[PDB]
């Protein structure tokens with residue numbers, strides 16, 4: 053604001069769970085604010101999200117970034133996380149942002165599964181959200197779950213198990229049952245204001261086809277396929293994601 | 303079971319909220335079990351649900367009935383309840399039931415909004431649930447929210463307010479935003495096993511058309527329109543609801 057600029061930790065509550073977040077506060081009495089959502093098994097402080105928040109702050113756009121339930125410093129077992137309860141987390145975050153007297157326009161920025169959270173939240177609040185940026189939005193998590201193949205781990209999609217060991221973690225069967233019937237594009241398409249879609253051509257985790265499909269469904273979208281970039285826009289590719297996001301939001 | 307028959311309180315946890323429930327335990331080493339879901343602003347112990355549980359118990363069918371978040375003895379503010387987080391509650395209840403070594407077949411029985419919870423849960427677990435009974439299932443809550451008229455209380459459906467005073471309570475705006483885009487029939491229709499639909503012709507809260515539509519969409523359903531009955535199957539009508547439910551489940 054006019055007096056404090058910098059970072060601050062903030063905590064919010066959603067159903068008895070504490071969500072831990074970082075606010076980047078810019079100069080100015082009035083500013084726009086982005087809510088930035090991390091991906092599946094990630095957290096609020098990846099290099100990609102920190103560099104996005106820093107870049108927005110340099111253009112006087114505030115941001116908040118929270119750990120979802122089951123991730124980072126927030127409460128809840130990973131096994132009990134779904135995309136649905138992350139959308140519930142995102143709504144709790146939005147409640148906090150929309151009541152802040154400094155905030156002019158609200159933007160959503162979401163990476164990978166956080167992009168599905170962002171796109172569906174904007175579709176639920178198309179009257180409120182002003183712009184959305186999706187980075188490799190993981191809409192394929194639905195098709196994956198219907199196929200019975202989630203990042204190399206296979207199961208019977210007709211009889212999903214109670215829980216699914218997944219790397220060092222345990223993925224909830226209810227995550228997958230939700231994923232199969234999530235109305236990702238139906239809800240997302242209700243947002244008719246500007247959307248920026250950014251996807252790397254060498255993304256091996258989520259096909260760039262997800263972003264091509266969003267670009268089809270959205271009334272006002274711009275698609276940027278980043279030649280050579282991977283799922284996390286790592287290393288040499290990271291500034292493509294940071295620049296496009298910053299330029300789009302202003 | 304073989305040794306204890308009667309009622310017991312049980313508590314479960316869903317995201318940091320405690321859910322309080324009543325188990326009716328019948329005679330027998332092995333038995334079927336019904337999960338019974340109450341409606342909007344109701345609780346696990348209405349006359350209708352108690353008489354259903356008692357009748358099932360007299361035919362050796364066990365049951366559990368929990369207060370949803372925001373209701374009765376369970377945790378959470380009413381203002382923070384949605385149909386989605388009630389489905390999350392219902393899944394937590396199902397986790398408890400499906401791991402009980404006595405239980406053979408699992409049935410869902412839901413009244414009004416609890417019928418929407420039941421129908422969508424069965425659509426997420428069509429491999430597991432064996433039969434469903436819906437009593438005046440409140441699928442019209444979606445159309446109501448799209449119209450901007452929820453039980454006489456009107457608002458702008460294009461810009462739903464943060465919160466909506468509703469009788470002695472405060473309904474969350476996010477309840478209504480969820481309601482508008484809930485894929486009630488899409489998810490519900492994935493359950494292809496037997497469904498019993500029961501609806502009173504004088505229901506002034508949820509049109510009997512909701513149950514006519516479920517009967518259209520379901521592969522294996524039976525519709526019973528109860529001439530003269532109201533939304534709660536109150537008084538002279540209550541045994542229509544209890545009898546049909548009991549006969550259907552066995």
Ligand SMILES: COc1cc(/C=C/C(=O)O)ccc1O
Pocket residue numbers: 090091092093163164165166190192193194196197201202203257258
């Ligand atoms: C769990 O299902 C999936 C999730 C991811 C998430 C990616 C991201 O968050 O980076 C991608 C594909 C899937 O099938």
Ligand SMILES: COc1cc(/C=C/C(=O)O)ccc1O
Pocket residue numbers: 340341342343413414415416440442443444446447451452453507508
């Ligand atoms: C909140 O929206 C509604 C919910 C009800 C719930 C009825 C029941 O649980 O008895 C019916 C119509 C509605 O528009």
Ligand SMILES: [Cl-]
Pocket residue numbers: 053054055080081
């Ligand atoms: Cl100030």
Ligand SMILES: [Cl-]
Pocket residue numbers: 061062063064
């Ligand atoms: Cl705080």
Ligand SMILES: [Cl-]
Pocket residue numbers: 057077078079109110111112113
């Ligand atoms: Cl600044």
Ligand SMILES: [Cl-]
Pocket residue numbers: 089090091094095098100101163164166
């Ligand atoms: Cl991320």
Ligand SMILES: [Cl-]
Pocket residue numbers: 097098099100
């Ligand atoms: Cl990192």
Ligand SMILES: [Cl-]
Pocket residue numbers: 102106
């Ligand atoms: Cl940093």
Ligand SMILES: [Cl-]
Pocket residue numbers: 102
């Ligand atoms: Cl840092």
Ligand SMILES: [Cl-]
Pocket residue numbers: 156157
């Ligand atoms: Cl403006």
Ligand SMILES: [Cl-]
Pocket residue numbers: 233234235485
């Ligand atoms: Cl859903």
Ligand SMILES: [Cl-]
Pocket residue numbers: 237238
């Ligand atoms: Cl689709």
Ligand SMILES: [Cl-]
Pocket residue numbers: 277278279
């Ligand atoms: Cl490029």
Ligand SMILES: [Cl-]
Pocket residue numbers: 303304305330331
């Ligand atoms: Cl026993």
Ligand SMILES: [Cl-]
Pocket residue numbers: 311312313314
């Ligand atoms: Cl217990």
Ligand SMILES: [Cl-]
Pocket residue numbers: 307327328329359360361362363
């Ligand atoms: Cl008995």
